[PDB]
């Protein structure tokens, strides 16, 4: 079995997100203002100047590229609640209409990256990796988590969709809830 340590502030962020998409009937505002690509690019471009040895930089770049590929391939499969699959279908439709394939890393924000991170240990323990490689992945993810906790005040604000504007969440109508959940 594998174990990952997540700061309790990000755990409360995840529980808040679970409360919203569930009995508050909110979805996320897409396309996000800060997407997964932007977060990972800023992280890598800020950390690559930190340590000098080339091996650290190679490992960092490989981890970021793999995280991008894996989020792309995993988002629709396992990372969406049941209310948010109608949104996924509408995005897929309006993408296929414009002859362009959907690329989820340029649309979805940091809360879905946090979902992927939190669910990573079970996906790791379900494969047949080494043990050195599992612990290397867990180390890289814990470093990313502490970096992200340092910036948590920049990506995870609370702004009340019902009050002013431009919060990270939006309210759903009864037609969306009728076709999404009760269909």
């Amino acid at each position: 079995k594998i174990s990952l340590q997540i700061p309790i502030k990000l755990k409360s962020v995840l529980v808040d997100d679970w409360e919203y998409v569930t009995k508050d009937k909110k979805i996320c505002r897409l396309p996000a203002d800060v997407t997964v690509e932007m977060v990972l690019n800023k992280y890598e471009h800020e950390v690559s100047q930190e340590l000098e040895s080339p091996g650290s930089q190679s490992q960092l770049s490989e981890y970021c590229a793999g995280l991008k590929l894996y989020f792309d391939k995993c988002l629709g499969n396992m990372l969406l609640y049941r209310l948010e699959r109608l949104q996924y279908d509408e995005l897929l439709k309006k993408s296929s209409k414009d002859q362009k394939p959907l690329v989820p890393i340029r649309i979805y924000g940091a809360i879905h990256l946090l979902r992927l991170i939190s669910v990573l240990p079970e996906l790791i323990s379900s494969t047949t990796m080494d043990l050195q490689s599992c612990q290397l992945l867990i180390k890289q993810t814990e470093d990313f988590l502490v970096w992200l906790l340092m910036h948590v005040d920049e990506y995870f604000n609370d702004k009340d969709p019902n009050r002013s504007d431009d919060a990270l969440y939006v309210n759903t109508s009864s037609q969306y809830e009728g076709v999404a959940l009760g269909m």
Binding site: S174, Q175, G178, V179, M183
Partner: protein
Amino acid sequence: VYEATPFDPITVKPSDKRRVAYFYDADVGNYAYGAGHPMKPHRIRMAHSLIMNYGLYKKMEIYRAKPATKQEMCQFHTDEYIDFLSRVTPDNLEMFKRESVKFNVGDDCPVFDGLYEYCSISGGGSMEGAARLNRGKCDVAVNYAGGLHHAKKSEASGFCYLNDIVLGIIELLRYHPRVLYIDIDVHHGDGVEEAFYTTDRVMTCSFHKYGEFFPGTGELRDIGVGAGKNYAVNVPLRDGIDDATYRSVFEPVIKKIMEWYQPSAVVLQCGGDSLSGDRLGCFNLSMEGHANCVNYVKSFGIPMMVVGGGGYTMRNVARTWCFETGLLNNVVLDKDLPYNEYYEYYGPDYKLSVRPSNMFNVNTPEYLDKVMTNIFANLENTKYA
């Protein structure tokens, strides 16, 4: 600021003689929602028979408004919802399983037969009724097939598929600056309050039962947003309210509204599920405690538009509507019913009266004090019409 009052009988005003117009389509009664659903357009037929056997046809003009078109319906609702309503039928329903869940038209509101035609009759009657009030050419306009105050812009709720009160008020707004809409159903008029929630040209005022009751909207603190703040009045009450209590709550609020808002036209939704012995309501009004509201709204003397509504027992609603129309024509009708086609529904007394129960009334004077004080404090900010 509530104070208890008795209930003195109804005496018509001899000065206020109004040229009433009555809208009835002889086809509306033949469309039945289902076997055992509590909605009957038959109660509109019954009523009419009474109205015709008392001799009330010699007193007013009787019309048959030409029915609404799919593009006068879409003045409020959306094209997709109206297209669904026009196309669906009880046989091809299995082919529309994704719009039956989006638009909510499967089981609480079923698909039965000639649904589009019932909606057309309702909407045409009410838009036409309101259009004759603007052309200078009536004073009251009665249309009992309307009053579907639950339907939303793209959804049906509460046995209502088309919101025709909103179409009528839109038709009224073309000539009148301010319009008032009073709702004395036992439910909340949520569709009419939603459609005009941010505007200061329509003022909605609804007296309803609040609790764990359908539709669960309409608290004392829902007063509007935007430019239409303080222009929405919700009066929530408890079970078993009676005639004297309802009168002492109804008359001061409406007098204050008329003094500060100063509407140019009224729309009174007189649905009769707030009567005694109903299938869904929980109030304890009688016939005269229900027609006193209509008489008081008629007192002020501005263009008026009376529409139907709920009502789950057919005989109570029929008799109350007949009595209300009679007193709109400045007569108090006899209490002995005449021989008509549906004479046997009105047993065992065969009289024009609806009896209350000995149900227990739970609306205390201090609760109504608090409610009316809050309402008047709010209304203080709508004065300069």
